C-alpha cells in the first residue's frame, strides 16, 4: 500500500483505489496503473522533475529502503500478477530488486523528490509507475 500526497492530490495505484478515490476522481489510467483523487487537506510531498535513474525505494515486504538504479519510463510487457493479467504497462521503470504485490505504493525518491510508486514485481525486478511527467500535480 501507499500514496503520494502533493497539493490537493492523492496518487495511488489504480488497482488499490478506494470508493472515496473514485468518488473524488481527478485522473486515472489503467495502462499506467495510476489514479489521482482530490483531497481536502494540502499534502507536502514534492514530485521530482528530472530524468534521474538512481534513487531509493521503500519495500514494505522487507521493511527496508533500497538504493536502486532504474530504467527510463517505457511500455513494457508485465507477466501476470495477483492484481493484473499479463499485459503492457506504460510509463513503467524497472530496477533489480524485491517487489511483492503488497509493496505496491512504496515511494521511489531521488534528490529532486518523489519519482514514482511501486507498481510491478517478479523475476527479481521491481517496476515503478513514473509520475514525473504529470506536471499538473504541481498546480491548481
Ligand atoms: Zn531526480
Question: How would you explain this protein's 3D organization?
Answer:
- It catalyses: Selective cleavage of Tyr-|-Gly bond in the picornavirus polyprotein.
- This is Protease 2A.
- Homodimer.
- It comes from Coxsackievirus A16 (strain G-10).
- This protein has 2 domains: 42 residues, no CATH class; 96 residues, no CATH class.
- Helices cover 4% and strands 52% of the residues.
- It contains 1 helix and 10 strands, in the order βαβββββββββ.
- The strands form 2 sheets. Strands 5-4-8-9-10-7-6 form a 7-stranded antiparallel β-sheet, with no helix packed on it.
- Strand 8 and strand 9 form a beta hairpin.
- The longest helix is centred in the N-terminal third of the chain and has 5 residues.
- The two termini are 26 Å apart.
- The structure holds zinc ion.
DSSP summary: helix tally: 1
Into which percent range does the helicity of residues fall?
under 10%
Bound molecules: zinc ion
How much of the polypeptide forms β-strand, as a percent range?
Answer: over 45%
Order of helices and strands: EHEEEEEEEEE
| Strand neighbour order, sheet with most strands | 5-4-8-9-10-7-6
Q: What is the domain tally? A: 2
Number of strands: 10
